[PDB]
Amino acid sequence: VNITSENLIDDVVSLIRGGTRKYAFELKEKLLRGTVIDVTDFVNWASSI
Amino acid sequence: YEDKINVGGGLSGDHCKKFGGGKTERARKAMAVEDIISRVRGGSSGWSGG
């Protein structure tokens, strides 16, 4: 007898709002799995909001 | 043994037993909790949050 079973579960969710659309969604795209957060994009988001 | 009349005799005995037992148990656990909080009352509309 040789029985093996494996189960995995993953749930990811995110949201954002405020500011102009361009800079906000630039922050959104660079934040989601970007792993390298920048300063200039966040300054753009700052002026946007 | 045989003398005036013959007498025959024969006997044999053999027994073998073998018992076995094997048990092994392994367990491993690990837990790590890391939380980061940052509150800044800077005074900028955007730069304080940034």
Curated annotation (Swiss-Prot), chain A:
Q: Which residues form a coiled coil?
A: none
Which residues are sugar-modified? 2
Which protein, by its recorded name, is this? Complement component C9b
Native species: Homo sapiens
Underlying gene:
C9
Full-protein interval shown: 414 to 462 of 559
From Swiss-Prot, chain B:
Q: Where are the transmembrane segments?
A: 7-12
Which compartments does it reside in? Secreted; Target cell membrane
Could you tell me what this protein does?
Component of the membrane attack complex (MAC), a multiprotein complex activated by the complement cascade, which inserts into a target cell membrane and forms a pore, leading to target cell membrane rupture and cell lysis. The MAC is initiated by proteolytic cleavage of C5 into complement C5b in response to the classical, alternative, lectin and GZMK complement pathways. The complement pathways consist in a cascade of proteins that leads to phagocytosis and breakdown of pathogens and signaling that strengthens the adaptive immune system.
Family listed: Belongs to the complement C6/C7/C8/C9 family.
Disease as annotated in the protein's UniProt record: Complement component 8 deficiency, 1: A rare defect of the complement classical pathway associated with susceptibility to severe recurrent infections, predominantly by Neisseria gonorrhoeae or Neisseria meningitidis.
Subunit annotation:
Heterotrimer of 3 chains: alpha (C8A), beta (C8B) and gamma (C8G); the alpha and gamma chains are disulfide bonded. Component of the membrane attack complex (MAC), composed of complement C5b, C6, C7, C8A, C8B, C8G and multiple copies of the pore-forming subunit C9.
The name of this protein is Complement component C8 alpha chain
Organism field? Homo sapiens (Human)
Q: Source organism lineage?
A: Eukaryota, Metazoa, Chordata, Craniata, Vertebrata
Instruction: Give the shown range, full length included.
Output: 384 to 433 of 584
